[PDB]
Amino acid sequence: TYYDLVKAFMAEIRQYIRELNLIIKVFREPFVSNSKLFSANDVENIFSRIVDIHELSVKLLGHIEDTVEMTDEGSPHPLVGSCFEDLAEELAFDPYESYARDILRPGFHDRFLSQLSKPGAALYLQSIGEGFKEAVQYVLPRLLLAPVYHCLHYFELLKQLEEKSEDQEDKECLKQAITALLNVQSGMEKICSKSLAKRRLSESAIKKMNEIQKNIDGWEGKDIGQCCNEFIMEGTLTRVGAKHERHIFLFDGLMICCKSNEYRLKEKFFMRKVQINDKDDTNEYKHAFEIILKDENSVIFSAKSAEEKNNWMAALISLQYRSTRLPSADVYRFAEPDSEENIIFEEGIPIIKAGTVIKLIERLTYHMYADPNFVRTFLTTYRSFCKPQELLSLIIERFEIPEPRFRKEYIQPVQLRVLNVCRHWVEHHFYDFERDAYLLQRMEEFIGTVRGKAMKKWVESITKIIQRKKSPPTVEWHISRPGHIETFDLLTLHPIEIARQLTLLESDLYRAVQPSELVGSVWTKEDKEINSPNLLKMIRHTTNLTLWFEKCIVETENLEERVAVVSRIIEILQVFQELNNFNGVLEVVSAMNSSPVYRLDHTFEQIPSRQKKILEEAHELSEDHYKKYLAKLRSINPPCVPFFGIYLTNILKTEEGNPEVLKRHGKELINFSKRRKVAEITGEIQQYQNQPYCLRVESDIKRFFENLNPMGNSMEKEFTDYLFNKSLEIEPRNPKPLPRFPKKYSYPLKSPGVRPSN
Template sequence: MVMAIQSATDLLAVGQTLDLALNTALATEKAAQSLVVAARALVQEKEMADNSAPLARAPNDPYGRKPSMATIMDRTTEEIMYNHDNDSDIEPDLAPRSAPKQPHSAMSSQRNRSDSQPSIFSAHSNQSGPFTPGTEYSGRGIQGGFPFPTSTGEGGFGGVANSATPGRYDMRGEKVKKMLGDDAPGRGGAQYWFLGYDYQQADLVLNAEGGVKGGTLPALIERLTLHDGLDSNFIATFLLTYRSFTSTKELFTYLFHRFTIQPPMGLDPEELEIWTEKKLTPIRLRVFNIIKSWLETYYLEDEADDREALAMIKDFSGSAAMKDTMSFAAVQLIKLVEKREQSEGAFRKMVLNLTTQAPQPITPRNLKKIKFLELDPLEFARQLTIMEANAYNKIKPVECLAKAWTSEDPEIAAKAVNIKKMIETSNLYSNWINELVLSEKELKKRVLVIRHLVMIAEKLRQLNNFSMLSATMAALSQSPIHRLKRTWEQVPSRTMTAFMDLQALMGVAKNWAEYREELHSVNPPCVPFVGMYLTDLVMIQDGNGDFLKKSNHLINFYKRVKTAEVIREIQQYQSVPYCLTSVPEIQSFIRRGQDCTKSVADLYEMSLQLEPR
């Protein structure tokens, strides 16, 4: 259920489907190449058999000569590659290979105009479902089943752009040639040096799975807007965490520069047309969709940097650079900016139609003078859950970066205002719970309060409110209450068993192993224990440098990947609201108790008066 909700609300879910389709196409390619190897072996066997037999006339050769090995392999290769290109609906806009082969050195071929990239005004631009930034205004999420090779140019290096792993230079062509010889089947499409990547190979480091491990900021920006592929996971991680290594204004400065890239020197008119169609246009679409996604999902109205970026986007969208090339996209961005300027926080929020009716509140007879023991444990837990869920749902991704909630710098600490508020509420609630127990002078009444609190904790678990469950367990384990030996001896065994079970559930043993297992097994709505996430974020922040080892310029993107994983888990529980009815009188009672609670030192003195040492 959690995974389904996450997928339904994830703007990047479409990219995963495209990746699956691409992997299928690549598997087909490998099968075709294996077939070529087998065909070559058969032809060699046939030649050996023919050499040992009397010379036979070739059907179309009046002199009885056999077709050469190169001719057979050329025909076999072309037939196989032709079928591969024309049968796949994932492959790029390559012309069928029925035409005679042209020399590789020419580096030019007849171009099929009907196979050009779709326009931004195509039907795909009106899709209403979840989208991946960089794909909703283009016909395909990943351009081409095969990359466009690049030859070694001035200041460059050998290798081809690899669509299977976007952003990685592919050196497999030479390996295939070594294995199969000069008759090895070629890759689809012409090999254009000017369709390579603009960053140097050393500027981007990938891991064994093809994910980004680190890179310079320009290389990461280029990866964000690749012309020959789409890495949806990278895009999501980048937009969630970019504030930890750059500013919003610097990001958009790079994106605007990326939108207006210039062609390499020395291109003839045909090459310039190919460069424009295969590189410039896809990049501009990517940039547009990244900006659009940022405006809809990642803009923070409390950030001065973001508000200034709105003016930058508006000016750029109205400039000739974008208005003359992508007028429709420019209008869309201007409308989004104006909508952001007029909105007050609410923007493209998911609204769920709750078909189930909220349960009837269980209220005490006298709401004007509420007593704790007169409150129904379930209703008390419901009101706690409503209040805590509202606070949890306000947490923003930027609050999870660089341990902002622990910073002594007021400007940085202000970014984590909601996390700090939840921590403060938890501490005040724990002190209030202590005071509720210690305010009772009679031992039997203290036992009743403890029993009531354990029942509330059980209801909190039923409501999946692990945040207040953890706070309740922590309160009952604090020294002012924990030391009351005579009081705990009178607590019923059933209550003690439940208390011990809940304490084990929320315990820190094995990095909250039992709690993590239960959290990942429940269905939303849910309010997780934020303290566990903060511990994970501190471990990631302190255990990984901002830059890769032995480098002071390659941003450690793996660190941001791990941070984004925690942020996504926090976000997935913010999607589903609770269907409960607020009771203002009970919530006011809870707030008054938290605001007027005593300090820990005063509570310990109260404990000593009840049961001296």
């Protein structure tokens, strides 16, 4: 897919960038350092545009990285067409043609060697360190081809992306990049097709391991796979002293010397020892080198040509040496450095515990890294410590960065994060803008203030989201037919539909609670009916249902029917679990663990095993202080109805368990951290209020559960006592025999099941 190619490309350019670094910092720096031995041109004649190419590459990868991270679920794949088009339009790839021209010129290597053999050069290279002179002479010329391979692949990469793009605007950018690169491509094409160049490029261009050992007779020691990880070379060489030219397989861990008959093992050498170069000798051996093994006798090989010898030394020498800001004045910024008076972290990204709105927003738009999780949490819970209008102002103040240069690794990324926050805000929290027309205006004015010629094209995606913001399963039925309200009851309705409608009811109830009903533990004070009317309406429904389940069970005097009643309820619990309705889960669990229902041993006795496990699995969610429930909530994907109680206890305790004021030097400072902690819980609550249920509403069934009133006109205690005395009546204590009661229901008690029709 387009995305696979991009992932593959990112890994490739990262390895490549590392190779460019090696070339620049390790091989080139020593020539640059010895001004007396090498002039600017000498360096130029060997390394060409290597530095520009490195800069272009880091720039390319950087843009592609931001693009990917800023790619929301709204796109079929990150759109990198523009990353390439912006660069191609500025003729940024021209350095590659010049580079290829310098490196693939016919006389390159000869001139390269003369530079290594002129007075004092060889000695200077040796003084750099062990292996440098050998690496420079036999390995560097190969590495110097990397930019050519890399750029040639670009031409093919762009074509494939163009063909696979799932976005018309992205496709267009790619077509344009391809076009803008035609000159560079035909230019490099002419350079690379010439015979010598073509040979050079071809030169440096575990099923195999087992396939190779299987074709070698008289094997010794362990398998190739038991000491090698890759296959490097396969050629022919002559061992000075041996009778027949040996065929050789070179692995990172083994140089295997065979005799062709297909082959017979002759020498099995372990790669972990020195390799020395040898000058030609009248001894008929030319293009030779010496291999030195541990406590073993040296062996000398000879290749067919100097080109062959070069390929072997390149690989062999590489194997031997394989191991080898200033922001503004603070009086114009967020420049204040981190301290204990700024941010505190929780004891790869650092988790924040507390901090100033300034430092908080700084980390929300941090230059070092992107924090998509911190951005998701902040935009869900910030309204408790910052007002929407103040947030936009702080964001704008964060964007408009004043210069004191290196501000491409600070100004470019910070402005990026700021805009990704704006996108997330408008995308997942548009209610802030529907509620304040001026807030939207300031946002549209700010978006239209973006300067970057390239940034505008990227920011158009944000504008599109703004303009935008301006089939569910069949209703299941059982014994009761649609419209027959009178007949509605726990066993008459379909168990699946009961759980479905209770979930819709319970979801709406949950989504209606405002943070102004929670903040300040307001639902616990004397004016709770006034300040938290939605919260109480939700809790009262939960209570109402827990009680209705108990009443249904306990008032079903006949044991057979009661077992049937307890069974549907467990079934309803199962669908609640499927629908991720935790309020509804704890609703049933609570009824099951109530005093009147808990002790009905005769009832639970006849309840199937699978159902007992579903219930037990449910009860375990509460254990250890909801440890499992808290875990499961995190692990699921909405919609869902969380259990509200835990949030209530956490807000109340956070407010009552932490001071309202911190004292310092006799002065009274307001503990804001405490208020921030409340806002995070509030924020979490609001996040779960977004996603709606893909379920069809059944108005009549909904009205049935909305009008349930188990308690009637009785007070709590009078009713609770009635349930318990009913439990004792239907299942008296031990020594008292279990009486029989007449049937209550005149319809079949067989459940239609929990699996939907089709």
